[PDB]
Amino acid sequence: QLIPNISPDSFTVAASTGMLSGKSHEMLYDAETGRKISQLDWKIKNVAILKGDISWDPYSFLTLNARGWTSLASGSGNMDDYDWMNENQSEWTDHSSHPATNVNHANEYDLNVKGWLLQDENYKAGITAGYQETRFSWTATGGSYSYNNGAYTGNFPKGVRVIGYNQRFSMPYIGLAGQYRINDFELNALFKFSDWVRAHDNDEHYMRDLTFREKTSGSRYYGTVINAGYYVTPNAKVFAEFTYSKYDESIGGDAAGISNKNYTVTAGLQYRFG
């Protein structure tokens, strides 16, 4: 006991468990006018996740880090599907609702380096660069629909898959990293940024016998990771961690939009091996 034991050339392993929530958008625009034609909102309500982190400090100023998380199994979601079929009307004309939407899986990994530019007894600050990929998959089942401004309504067959959807975001990124420590308490914060996001999606409209594929390049991402922990021993830190990620926006170029926001909240244990 005392303060944390941090030796040269040491490494850490951490695992945490908790929840993922968020919302993705799947967009179709009229490439000619920029007008939005379709928008599907895909919610992630509660998905249980397991998250891991391994870090190695080969030098006092350099950290190498591999981290990731995965859904433990499918989780709960929701999907709402809007179309603006009337160019002479601002409100959408069609809305389908699918409360019975499953989040089949979600995962992420992030490989990065941190270079510490400022270091003292209680504070650390540096820059980070890395590569990250995140994937989400949903299946919307059953549900109801209102078409033509509510003139026509009805239900999809209960439990039958209607639309399958998956997204993938891949990017190199850069960022800033900070740490504050007093006694046995430690706070880490990271801010991440990219203007180089590559996004892909696949959509299966099972009842229409249609499949869509969209891709966009050069979009923006912002993310943060905040971790607050307590060293119960000099080598073992129990912690809670919050992350937030925003990915800004057959189908290409000006017709496509693919976006996501998500957050995670987890708790776990980090151990440092001298």
From Swiss-Prot:
E.C. no: 3.4.23.48
Biological process per Gene Ontology, one example term: proteolysis
Phenotype for H205N: No plasminogen cleavage
Coiled-coil boundaries: none
Catalysed reactions listed for this entry: Converts human Glu-plasminogen to plasmin by cleaving the 560-Arg-|-Val-561 peptide bond that is also hydrolyzed by the mammalian u-plasminogen activator and t-plasminogen activator. Also cleaves arginyl bonds in other proteins
Impact reported for R208 to A/K: Very low plasminogen cleavage
GO molecular function annotations of the record: aspartic-type endopeptidase activity
Cellular location(s): Cell outer membrane
Consequence when changing D81N: About 15% plasminogen cleavage
GO cellular component: cell outer membrane
pH profile: Optimum pH is 6-7 for plasminogen cleavage.
Keyword terms of this UniProt record: Aspartyl protease, Cell outer membrane, Hydrolase, Membrane, Plasmid, Protease, Signal, Transmembrane, Transmembrane beta strand, Virulence
The keyword Transmembrane helix appears for this protein: no
Disulphide bridges, residue numbers: none
Keyword Signal: yes
Side of membrane Extracellular, spans: 18-47, 72-108, 132-171, 194-221
Protein name per Swiss-Prot or TrEMBL: Plasminogen activator
Transmembrane segments: 9-17, 48-57, 62-71, 109-117, 123-131, 172-181, 185-193, 222-232, 236-244, 263-273
Main location: membrane
Effect ascribed to mutating D83N: Extremely low plasminogen cleavage
Domain notes: Forms a narrow, elliptical 10-stranded beta barrel with the active site pairs on the extracellular surface.
